[PDB]
Design a protein around this nucleic acid. Sequence first.
RNA 1: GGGAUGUGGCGGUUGACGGCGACGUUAGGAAGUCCGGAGACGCCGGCGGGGGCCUCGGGAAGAGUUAUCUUUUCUGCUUAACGGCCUGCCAACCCUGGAAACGGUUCAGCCGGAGGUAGGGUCCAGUGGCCGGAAGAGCACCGGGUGUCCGGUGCGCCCCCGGCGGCCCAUGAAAAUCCGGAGGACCGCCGUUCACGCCCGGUCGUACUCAUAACCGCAUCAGGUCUCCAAGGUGAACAGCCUCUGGCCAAUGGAACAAUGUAGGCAAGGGAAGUCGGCAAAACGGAUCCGUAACUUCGGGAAAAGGAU
RNA 2: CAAAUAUUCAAAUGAGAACUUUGAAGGCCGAAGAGGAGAAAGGUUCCAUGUGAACGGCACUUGCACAUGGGUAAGCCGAUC
Lengths: 106, 89, 50, 68, 101
Amino acid sequence: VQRLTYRKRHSYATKSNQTRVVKTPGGKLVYQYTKKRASGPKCPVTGKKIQGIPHLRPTEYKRSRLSRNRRTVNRPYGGVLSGPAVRERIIRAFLVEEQKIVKKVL
Amino acid sequence: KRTKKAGIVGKYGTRYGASLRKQIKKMEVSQHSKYFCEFCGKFAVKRKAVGIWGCKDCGKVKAGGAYTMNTASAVTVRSTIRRLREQTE
Amino acid sequence: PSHKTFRIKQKLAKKQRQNRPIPYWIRMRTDNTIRYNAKRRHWRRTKLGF
Amino acid sequence: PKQIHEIKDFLLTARRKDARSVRIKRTKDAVKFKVRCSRYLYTLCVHDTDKANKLKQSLPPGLNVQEV
Amino acid sequence: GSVSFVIDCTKPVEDKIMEIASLEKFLQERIKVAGGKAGNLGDSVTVTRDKSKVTVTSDGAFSKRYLKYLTKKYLKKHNVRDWLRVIAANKERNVYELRYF
RNA sequence: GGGAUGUGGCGGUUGACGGCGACGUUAGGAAGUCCGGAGACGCCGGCGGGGGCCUCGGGAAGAGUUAUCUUUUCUGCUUAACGGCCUGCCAACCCUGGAAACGGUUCAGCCGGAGGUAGGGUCCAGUGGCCGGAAGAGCACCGGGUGUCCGGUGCGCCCCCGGCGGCCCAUGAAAAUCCGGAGGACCGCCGUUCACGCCCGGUCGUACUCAUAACCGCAUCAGGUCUCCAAGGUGAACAGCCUCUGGCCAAUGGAACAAUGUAGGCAAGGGAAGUCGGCAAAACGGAUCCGUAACUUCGGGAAAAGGAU
RNA sequence: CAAAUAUUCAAAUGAGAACUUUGAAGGCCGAAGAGGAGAAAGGUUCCAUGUGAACGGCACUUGCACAUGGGUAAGCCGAUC
Ligand SMILES: [K+]
Ligand SMILES: [K+]
Ligand SMILES: [K+]
Ligand SMILES: [K+]
Ligand SMILES: [K+]
Ligand SMILES: [K+]
Ligand SMILES: [K+]
Ligand SMILES: [K+]
Ligand SMILES: [Mg+2]
Ligand SMILES: [Mg+2]
Ligand SMILES: [Mg+2]
Ligand SMILES: [Mg+2]
Ligand SMILES: [Mg+2]
Ligand SMILES: [Mg+2]
Ligand SMILES: [Mg+2]
Ligand SMILES: [Mg+2]
Ligand SMILES: [Mg+2]
Ligand SMILES: [Mg+2]
Ligand SMILES: [Mg+2]
Ligand SMILES: [Mg+2]
Ligand SMILES: [Mg+2]
Ligand SMILES: [Mg+2]
Ligand SMILES: [Mg+2]
Ligand SMILES: [Mg+2]
Ligand SMILES: [Mg+2]
Ligand SMILES: [Mg+2]
Ligand SMILES: [Mg+2]
Ligand SMILES: [Mg+2]
Ligand SMILES: [Mg+2]
Ligand SMILES: [Mg+2]
Ligand SMILES: [Mg+2]
Ligand SMILES: [Mg+2]
Ligand SMILES: [Mg+2]
Ligand SMILES: [Mg+2]
Ligand SMILES: [Mg+2]
Ligand SMILES: [Mg+2]
Ligand SMILES: [Mg+2]
C-alpha cells in the first residue's frame, strides 16, 4: 500500500523526527517532516494563554519572519500579562497609593 | 455495595495483610479528599504532592500535612504562636 | 559508516591505492627478487583496525 | 507565487524594471497572465476574451512575451 | 433526458467479419432495464439499426460501460474477440467502435 | 542568514489609527538598567478532531472471464513547499443581564452572585476549504487527441493534535536561541521592526551492505547485533492459517526404500499393572446459558466443581 | 556433504549447463516479511567490461573472486552551535 521510508538519516522516532504523510502530484506518498507543537505565550500571574499571538517555535517569532501585529498586543504589558492581570495591577497600584496618603494624614 | 468493608483499599486485593490495609485506609481516604478553601469558600483543595495543597478554582497553593491539609499539631502550633504574640504585647 | 571523519577517509584512500599488483616490468629488473605484493589485503579477511 | 486581482496592478508590475517575461497560459475557462519578477511570479486571471486581447496589446513593448 | 450510445461497426462489415443484424438482435434480447428481467424490451430502452452502426436510446439512465460489456460478450459468442476490440471513439464520448488489433 | 543601498509609502498633538471590551490593522521614537514568556519536558485511561490507509456505491478509460451466468472481476482516475482570502474545532477570554420551582452539562467529570443558563462577540490550530503554484507536471488510454469526475460510511488501522480524568513517602533536564514588556535619560528635517529593489553564502561527510554472505563470532557459521513503514480474508486479535505488492526457490545432485536411528502419527481389550517417580504422551481448551463448595486477611477461592448448546 | 516445504518444461549461450540468461508453469516468505530504508561496524564489497590459475567445502559459461577502468556535487540534509 506504498509503505514509506525516512528521507534523512534520522532512524529513531524522536519528537524532533515526527513526520506526516502527504500525497504528491506524482501520485505517490512521501513523508514530510513537521514542527514540534509549541506552547504560546503564557501569563505569569494567571497561568492562562495570552490572546492574540500564534503558537510557534521560538525562532519563528523572529522579527524578519513574523509581522509586528502578530507579535504584540496594544495594551501595557501587552504580550506579557493578560487583561485581568493588568486590571488588577492598575487597581492595586492606585488603591494602595491612596492608602499611603491616608496613613500619612492619620 | 460492591464491598462490605474494603472501600478504597480493595485496589490492593488480598495482599499485604488485613491490618496494614486497615492502617493505610485512613490516609488513602484523607489524601484523596477535597478540603475547604478558606480563601474562596469552596471545597476545591486537592493534594498536589506530599505537603502541597492547591485549590482548583481560586488557585491558592498552601503548605500543609503529608496526607491531610491541616495536621492536628498545626492547629495547636498556630494557637500557641497566637497566644505568645498577644501576650508579647 | 556513511558518516566519516576526514582523517578516516584520507587513510582509507591510501589503503585503496596500496593494494594493487606489482608492475610487470619490476620483475624484469637486473637484480630482482620481488615476486608478489606480499601486502595485498582483502576486505573480507584481514580487517584494518581503525 | 502571488495572484493579482485587478488589471491595473498587473500593468504596473509588468512595467517594473525587474520584470523579465510574461507568460500567457490559455485554459478552457480563462486566460492567465504570469509576469516573472525578481522574487515572485504574479498571476492574473482574465475571464474575458477581449480583455485578454486588450491586455495583450497594451503590454510594455520592452518586456518579453511568451505563449504557453 | 435522451441518452444515446452508438456502436460503430463500419470497418468490420466492409471486411465481412460479422453482421450488425446479429449484433442488434443480441442487444434486444440481452438488456436489463430498471433492474428488471434480461431482454424485456420495455418502453424506455430501444435499439435501432443502420447500415454500419447500432444505436441504443432511452429516456431514463443508461450506462455506456454496460454497452461495452454486452458488445464484448457478443464478440466472444461469435468468435471475434481475438480479432476485434471495442474502443471509445476519439471524436465522441457517446460512441464506441470495433477496431482490429 | 548576512551586507549594502535606493524608490515608494508611513509618523511628527515629536514618536499612527480603530474597538465599550476581548482585541484588530502591512508601518507607526529611543540609552544604561530591570521583568516575563517560549525553548521546556513523567506514566496510565477514556473521549473528540485532522492527515494517510482500508472499505461501499456511481460515472468514464483500459484489461480478465465468457458451453452457461455475471449492468460483472481487476487496475488506475493525482495535486508539494510556499503566498493570499475564508473558516474557525475543543478549551481560554470579552460585553449585556441577573439565576430556587435551582439550573447548565460529560462516556466519566464538573460549572455558576468570585456572575450560570441565554444572547452577542474576541482569540487560538489545522496535516481544514478556495484561489495562486498548476496542468504546461504526473498518470491512464487512443492514434498529436481524450480524461484526470461524483458521492457514502466507521468502537476500523497508523501518525499527530486537543481536552478531561487518574497516580506518586516517584512530581518526571539544562543551556544556546528567539519574542514580549516596564522605564524614558536623549533627540526634529529626521525617524521608520513597512513594500518593492541590489549583492553574497566557507569547511568536512554523502557510493554500497546493514545481514541465514558486506558488522562480531578464526568461515559465505541455523548464534549475536539499536530502529522507521506495514495491505485483503477468517477471527477478540500485529495469534495461527491462506492471499496481493515486493522478494524469492539459495541451501551438491541422481537411484532405491534394509536393519538401527531422528522427527511426526495411529493402534483391539485392559487402563499406571510400567517406572525412583505418570518421565513422555493423551485427555481439557473458543463462545453463549445455567450452576458453583470448604476455607478466607471478606479483597478472594472462581474459568472452582458440575451440566446444556 | 540430511534444519529453514520445490521444483519442472522449451529455448538461447557456451568446448562443456541439474546450477548462467529469457519465457512458461508449480510453489514459499505473507507484510513485528525471506519486502522497502537507516544508526553502529566495514571500507570499495557499489557499476561496467573482461577472465589463466586459485577461491565460491558438487559444479559454473559464472562472482561479494580476480584484472582494468568509472563512480559520492548541498547557504536549506547532517556535523558544526
Ligand atoms: K496580536
Ligand atoms: K528534553
Ligand atoms: K517547508
Ligand atoms: K548520498
Ligand atoms: K550473516
Ligand atoms: K529406516
Ligand atoms: K505408577
Ligand atoms: K552545510
Ligand atoms: Mg568479517
Ligand atoms: Mg591488529
Ligand atoms: Mg492505572
Ligand atoms: Mg452564549
Ligand atoms: Mg492551483
Ligand atoms: Mg497532462
Ligand atoms: Mg506503527
Ligand atoms: Mg514604553
Ligand atoms: Mg509498526
Ligand atoms: Mg470478522
Ligand atoms: Mg494475523
Ligand atoms: Mg545444508
Ligand atoms: Mg541425496
Ligand atoms: Mg489402545
Ligand atoms: Mg477405565
Ligand atoms: Mg507401581
Ligand atoms: Mg514393578
Ligand atoms: Mg520407590
Ligand atoms: Mg506432562
Ligand atoms: Mg481449587
Ligand atoms: Mg549432518
Ligand atoms: Mg539448486
Ligand atoms: Mg507457513
Ligand atoms: Mg503461504
Ligand atoms: Mg537496497
Ligand atoms: Mg555486483
Ligand atoms: Mg569447488
Ligand atoms: Mg577485488
Ligand atoms: Mg539542518
